[PDB]
Ligand binder design. Structure first.
Ligand code: 3IO
Ligand code: 3IO
Ligand code: FE
Ligand code: FE
Lengths: 119, 111
């Protein structure tokens, strides 16, 4: 009686996001999780932001990964300051900070995941 | 700005970690894994953790990655995208059957 979730992703609305964001871990799974995890492969998102600047009441981590280092690059806007992230990278967005990301470069198999940390 | 770029962190279980419990003043999860196209590896070692572990299997397009999860004497064949909970104490491991470049399995230890 293993617990398996395959009805994925779970689309959930997130502030300032044009479309519901694709979640792979949500806070209610498996009796309750201390994180939520959303994101996707970036190869078709180059130049196309998924959201306008937005604020969360929880910390969010951007996790940028690609098969080979350097194959993915995003620009993170953090309270009006721009930061370039190169795969592999993890960036913490403190709760209350206005932020969003723009994909600069991405191969097939490049991902950015946003990990909401449950406080 | 808090950015970590010295990644992955090899830790003994050695697994490549992208989130460790000490990052950013303390995290409630740890996250390890890697892309699967080079793991498609004839064997894999059963092991147990003291915390729950979630397998998160993804590929650029749905269905492009496939693993076998062995959990306490039962074999499970999972197709991307999939998430599977491995309860703390349960003997387990996974084997990659099929994976396009850019497929990942992450093991997420839930504190
Ligand atoms: O895989 C795609 O095409 C996406 O929609 C990616 C995506 C949507 N919302 C996000 C929030 C954080 C990281 C990636 C995404
Ligand atoms: O050894 C490597 O290069 C790996 O990719 C290890 C790995 C891939 N997926 C995982 C999930 C949980 C623990 C280790 C791995
Ligand atoms: Fe955000
Ligand atoms: Fe494990």
């Amino acid at each position: 009686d293993a617990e398996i979730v395959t009805a994925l992703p779970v689309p959930l609305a997130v502030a300032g996001h044009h479309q519901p964001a694709p979640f792979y871990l949500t806070a209610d799974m498996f009796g309750g999780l201390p994180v939520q995890l959303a994101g996707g492969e970036l190869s078709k998102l180059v130049g196309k932001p998924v959201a306008a600047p937005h604020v969360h009441e929880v910390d969010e981590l951007y996790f940028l990964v690609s098969p080979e280092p350097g194959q993915a690059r995003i620009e993170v806007h953090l309270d009006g300051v721009r930061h370039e992230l190169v795969s592999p990278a993890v960036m913490r967005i403190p709760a209350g900070s206005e932020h969003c990301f723009l994909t600069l470069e991405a191969t097939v198999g490049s991902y950015c995941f946003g990990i909401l940390v449950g406080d």
